[PDB]
Design a protein around this motif. Structure first.
Motif, short mmCIF file in Angstrom:
data_model
loop_
_atom_site.label_atom_id
_atom_site.label_comp_id
_atom_site.label_asym_id
_atom_site.label_seq_id
_atom_site.Cartn_x
_atom_site.Cartn_y
_atom_site.Cartn_z
N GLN A 74 35.24 37.86 37.78
CA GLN A 74 36.52 37.72 38.48
C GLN A 74 37.66 38.12 37.54
O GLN A 74 38.65 38.71 37.96
CB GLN A 74 36.73 36.30 38.98
CG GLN A 74 36.72 36.17 40.49
CD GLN A 74 35.91 34.97 40.94
OE1 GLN A 74 36.15 34.48 42.05
NE2 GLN A 74 34.96 34.50 40.14
N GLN A 75 37.49 37.80 36.26
CA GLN A 75 38.48 38.20 35.27
C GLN A 75 38.52 39.71 35.14
O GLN A 75 39.55 40.32 35.40
CB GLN A 75 38.19 37.56 33.91
N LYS A 76 37.41 40.33 34.75
CA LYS A 76 37.35 41.77 34.61
C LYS A 76 37.83 42.47 35.88
O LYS A 76 38.60 43.42 35.80
CB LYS A 76 35.94 42.25 34.27
CG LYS A 76 35.95 43.39 33.24
CD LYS A 76 37.03 43.13 32.20
CE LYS A 76 37.21 44.29 31.24
NZ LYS A 76 35.99 44.53 30.40
N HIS A 103 39.93 41.73 38.24
CA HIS A 103 41.36 41.93 38.43
C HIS A 103 41.95 42.76 37.30
O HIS A 103 42.92 43.48 37.54
CB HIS A 103 42.04 40.56 38.58
CG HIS A 103 42.20 40.17 40.03
ND1 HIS A 103 41.40 40.60 41.06
CD2 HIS A 103 43.18 39.42 40.60
CE1 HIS A 103 41.84 40.10 42.20
NE2 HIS A 103 42.92 39.37 41.95
N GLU A 104 41.38 42.65 36.11
CA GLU A 104 41.93 43.43 34.99
C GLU A 104 41.96 44.93 35.33
O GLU A 104 43.01 45.55 35.28
CB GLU A 104 41.14 43.21 33.70
N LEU A 105 40.80 45.46 35.71
CA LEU A 105 40.75 46.89 36.04
C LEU A 105 41.62 47.19 37.24
O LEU A 105 42.30 48.22 37.32
CB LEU A 105 39.31 47.34 36.30
CG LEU A 105 38.37 47.25 35.11
CD1 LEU A 105 37.42 48.43 35.05
CD2 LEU A 105 39.18 47.15 33.83
N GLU A 106 41.58 46.28 38.21
CA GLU A 106 42.31 46.48 39.46
C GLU A 106 43.79 46.71 39.23
O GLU A 106 44.51 47.32 40.02
CB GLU A 106 42.09 45.27 40.36
CG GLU A 106 41.01 45.48 41.40
CD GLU A 106 40.64 44.16 42.07
OE1 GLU A 106 41.38 43.17 41.87
OE2 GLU A 106 39.62 44.13 42.78
N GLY A 107 44.31 46.21 38.12
CA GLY A 107 45.71 46.42 37.78
C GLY A 107 45.87 47.73 37.02
O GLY A 107 46.86 48.42 37.24
N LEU A 108 44.89 48.03 36.16
CA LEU A 108 44.90 49.33 35.52
C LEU A 108 44.77 50.40 36.61
O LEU A 108 45.54 51.36 36.63
CB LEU A 108 43.79 49.46 34.49
N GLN A 160 47.81 50.89 38.41
CA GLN A 160 48.83 51.43 37.53
C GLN A 160 48.70 52.93 37.40
O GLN A 160 49.67 53.67 37.61
CB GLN A 160 48.74 50.72 36.16
CG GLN A 160 49.68 51.35 35.15
#
Lengths: 46, 47, 47, 46
Positions: free
Chosen positions: D6-8, D10-15, D18
């Motif tokens: 769940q952490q990863k 959203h991390e990529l999802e913002g990259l 972007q």
């Protein structure tokens, strides 16, 4: 006279030919209709 | 709108222009002539 | 192949590109993007 | 763990969001399929 007309007719016809050869239409166009009257005046003046 | 397309119409137009000219149809002869002028320059940019 | 035609497809493509991007369809998103790059430059020459 | 995933995710999802925003697809594309596995591993790892 028919002689001059025949004279003028070929004169322009070489200019006309010449311009067109250098892609210079317009002139090609103007000379072309000049030839238009003379042919007529010829036929007229005969 | 590629160099190939350009070259194609460009070279096509080159004949049509000449063809008209042959039948004393200047004007057209002339317009096609300036079309090609652009067309050229375009091609050099599509490259 | 006029500035008007160019501007038309140019601005059309601008949405399509974005639209794909919206649906995660990159690649296409990208290709349309470089299409526009040319298309732009072309336009500036048709002027 | 689901937490990291769940952490990863959203991390990529913002990259991903972007890059695409700056028209940087490709990356947008790579990150996009990265997210593809993780979703799966998530569902797997749950």
């Amino acid at each position: 006279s028919p002689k001059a007309l025949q004279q003028k007719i070929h004169e322009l016809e070489g200019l006309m030919m010449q311009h067109a050869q250098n892609l210079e239409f317009e002139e090609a166009a103007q000379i072309r209709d000049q030839l238009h009257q003379l042919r007529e005046l010829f036929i007229a003046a005969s």
